[PDB]
XYZ file of C-alpha atoms in Angstrom:
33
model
C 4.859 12.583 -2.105
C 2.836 10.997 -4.998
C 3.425 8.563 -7.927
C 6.579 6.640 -8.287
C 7.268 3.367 -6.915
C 4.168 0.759 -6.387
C 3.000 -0.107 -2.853
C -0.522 -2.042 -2.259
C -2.316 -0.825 0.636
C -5.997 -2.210 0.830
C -9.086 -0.179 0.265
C -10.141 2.195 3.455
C -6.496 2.528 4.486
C -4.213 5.173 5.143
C -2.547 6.002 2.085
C 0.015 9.132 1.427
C 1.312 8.246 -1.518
C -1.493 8.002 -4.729
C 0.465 4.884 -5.423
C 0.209 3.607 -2.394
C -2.603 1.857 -2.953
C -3.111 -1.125 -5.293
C -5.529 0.838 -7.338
C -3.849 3.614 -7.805
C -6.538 5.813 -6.463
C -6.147 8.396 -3.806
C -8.858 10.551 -2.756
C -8.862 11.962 0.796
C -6.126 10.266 1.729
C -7.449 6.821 2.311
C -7.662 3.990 -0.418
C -10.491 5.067 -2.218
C -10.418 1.473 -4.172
């Protein structure tokens, strides 16, 4: 789901997880930053 754990996708990628990215930011689920 979301939070836990700490993977970096880059920014405009497909993210699931709010974590997922290295900003922490989720938003429609792409790497908002």
């Amino acid at each position: 789901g979301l939070i836990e754990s700490i993977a970096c996708m880059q920014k405009g990628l497909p993210c699931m997880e709010h974590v997922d990215c290295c900003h922490g930011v989720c938003d429609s689920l792409f790497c908002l930053y």
